[PDB]
Structure 1
């Protein structure tokens, strides 16, 4: 059964609600982005209208085989009427094709559903500038002040400089980057660009990337692993055993691996600066965990919410324990008392 924080009152709509069967009263199912916890349940047998971005619709059609007649892509930053209700899709600064959804209810209420997002001051100059928001369905993944991490730009600077130094010292070093979902493509694209290489990967991952509308992508990626000195591998293989096994397969072309694991936050963020990050090393293999986040830090989340000034907040992450719920509610009240709304 579909939980309350996935339902939009006064409409026939749900958000990210595909794992509950036929939801009673739902006339249109919105999908914010192509991550498995959110799409859980979609397939070629789905026969209701799905509303989403262009990029998410390319992924539904090619990767899950949802039929075309049930895919309804909407352009971003554009007022659209869906089943008699005005909606707008906004870029969520999460993975490719991820949106937030503004719903203008028939009674005058305005609701913002963030989906998953990484808040940014640039959102303060979107179509959100123009009207009041009564209710905020908020991605609370990192809603506690311990959750700090650097900008995406600092993280990429670190990765490019680390990879270029290692391969210039040793032209026989291979770089490997882990992945298990869409998102974080800048990590492997930026490293391949500095090295003058295409990125090599499996046919299954190439297919996924080909759905993303990335400019000049045919110039950046390949399935010919032999031509490439940046390889993508499943995240599960980014360990000393999996990397050893991969280096054997490369036919003595290489004698060293440098590997990257983009994680979200890890407790090593509470002590160490990005500049000071060091790898784990065994022999000729070194693994870096890099804190490349596609979710808001605590401070980015707090700034956005204090700017938006919603009348009510409904968390969509960390909802399963009383302790998490009580912690999140305390921060929401602090924010409101400090800013005066």
Structure 2
């Protein structure tokens, strides 16, 4: 495949999250917004062009994908930087650790925001974004439809902490399991382990990944000694009745209950009822690191871009058409 147009920044030689197309012709610099596999797809130890990213993303490139250090160009956040003759700023995307949005200040006075993947927040409206007009927006449209309503991260964490704390205080032999398949959503397991006074147990591979994320005091919070911990991280693929029944056999049968948390259910918060089989309960918690529809709408209506380019769900005519209809509705409502 060749690089799609929505991964190219016009008036520049820049691409964003475009590593799976080989040598992109006329690309002078490759930006990586965050360390999720659809975005880094293609990077390896044999990559020989400059990669611009956050420090955390660079740590993950170095240690997990074995990208050579000479090609990793970490940039600080909230700082005007010049990359191949163009002023850029990286901003926190409120996504996963190391995830950024990129502001490009084009020679002709155009300003472009690329959100990477993000969860829009009103905090962004009082940030550096407020200090200049932004003309073009490359937008994370993951949940650009009104049925995507889910609660705040804080509300979801409140539910998870309360559920776990109650269960473990009632039954000291209970185990909490959190599923994972990528970086992001670390707050779920860290918050639960904090309330329980436990470290989070995990594989060496997961431990290594977390050690790349610049989380303060991380050494006090995580461990590879599983049976010393009340909170385990497992691959998301194991979060099912058979997988958790098998896990219950570990640590000499020390545990007699599992409460597992699986991020899901995007389409009150107390109405989260688990799927239960005997002493295993699986809670499908709607913890998202992407904008809800209303969050996305608010951000775009505040920013008032002249042109929106979706970067997600662009593969079907139906999805493209429906997104463009929402953008038009938003524009007409707000008057821009």
Q: TM-score range by the shorter chain?
A: over 0.9
Q: Distance in 1 between matches of 2:110 and 2:255?
A: 61
Are the equivalent residues in 1 in contact too, given 2:55–2:75 (CA < 8 A)?
yes
Backbone CA RMSD of aligned residues = 0.9
Offset of 1:107 from its aligned partner? 1.5
Q: Distance in 2 between matches of 1:255 and 1:145?
A: 41
Secondary structure of the residue aligned to 1:87 is strand
Are the equivalent residues in 2 in contact too, given 1:147–1:297 (CA < 8 A)?
yes
Q: Distance in 2 between matches of 1:315 and 1:262?
A: 24
Are the equivalent residues in 2 in contact too, given 1:264–1:293 (CA < 8 A)?
no
Are the equivalent residues in 1 in contact too, given 2:204–2:224 (CA < 8 A)?
yes
Are residues 3 and 44 of structure 1, via their aligned partners in 2, closer, same or farther at CA, if it must alter by over 3 Å?
same
Q: Distance in 2 between matches of 1:149 and 1:102?
A: 28
Secondary structure of the residue aligned to 1:182 is coil
Q: Distance in 2 between matches of 1:264 and 1:172?
A: 28
Offset of 1:137 from its aligned partner? 0.4
Secondary structure of the residue aligned to 2:89 is strand
Offset of 1:141 from its aligned partner? 0.6
Are the equivalent residues in 1 in contact too, given 2:93–2:99 (CA < 8 A)?
yes
Matches within 5 A, 1:30-49: 30-49=31-50
Secondary structure of the residue aligned to 1:276 is coil
Offset of 1:252 from its aligned partner? 2.0
Secondary structure of the residue aligned to 2:177 is strand
Aligned length: 335
> After the TM superposition, which parts of structure 1 deviate over 6 Å for at least 4 consecutive aligned residues?
none
Q: Distance in 2 between matches of 1:117 and 1:277?
A: 25
Offset of 1:250 from its aligned partner? 2.1
Q: Distance in 2 between matches of 1:334 and 1:315?
A: 16
CA offsets 1:30-49 (integer angstroms, 9 cap, x no match): 00000000000000000000
Are the equivalent residues in 2 in contact too, given 1:262–1:289 (CA < 8 A)?
yes
**Length-normalised TM-score, structure 2:** 0.99
Offset of 1:283 from its aligned partner? 1.1
Secondary structure of the residue aligned to 1:264 is coil
CA offsets 1:73-126 (integer angstroms, 9 cap, x no match): 000000000001000000000000000000011121111000000000000011
Are the equivalent residues in 2 in contact too, given 1:54–1:73 (CA < 8 A)?
yes
Secondary structure of the residue aligned to 1:275 is coil
CA offsets 1:299-331 (integer angstroms, 9 cap, x no match): 000000000000000000110111111111111
Q: Distance in 1 between matches of 2:327 and 2:150?
A: 21
Offset of 1:263 from its aligned partner? 2.5
Q: Distance in 1 between matches of 2:39 and 2:185?
A: 18
Are the equivalent residues in 1 in contact too, given 2:261–2:283 (CA < 8 A)?
yes
Are residues 39 and 84 of structure 1, via their aligned partners in 2, closer, same or farther at CA, if it must alter by over 3 Å?
same
Offset of 1:52 from its aligned partner? 0.2
Q: Distance in 2 between matches of 1:37 and 1:275?
A: 33
Offset of 1:254 from its aligned partner? 1.1
CA offsets 1:231-252 (integer angstroms, 9 cap, x no match): 1100000001000111112212
Offset of 1:264 from its aligned partner? 6.0
Are the equivalent residues in 1 in contact too, given 2:265–2:284 (CA < 8 A)?
no
Are residues 119 and 43 of structure 1, via their aligned partners in 2, closer, same or farther at CA, if it must alter by over 3 Å?
same
Q: Does structure 1 residue 63 correspond to structure 2 residue 58? A: no
Q: Distance in 2 between matches of 1:277 and 1:289?
A: 7
Are the equivalent residues in 2 in contact too, given 1:87–1:104 (CA < 8 A)?
yes
Q: Does structure 1 residue 308 correspond to structure 2 residue 309? A: no
CA offsets 1:252-306 (integer angstroms, 9 cap, x no match): 21111111101261xxxxxx92112111111111110000000000000000000
Q: Does structure 1 residue 98 correspond to structure 2 residue 93? A: no
**Length-normalised TM-score, structure 1:** 0.97
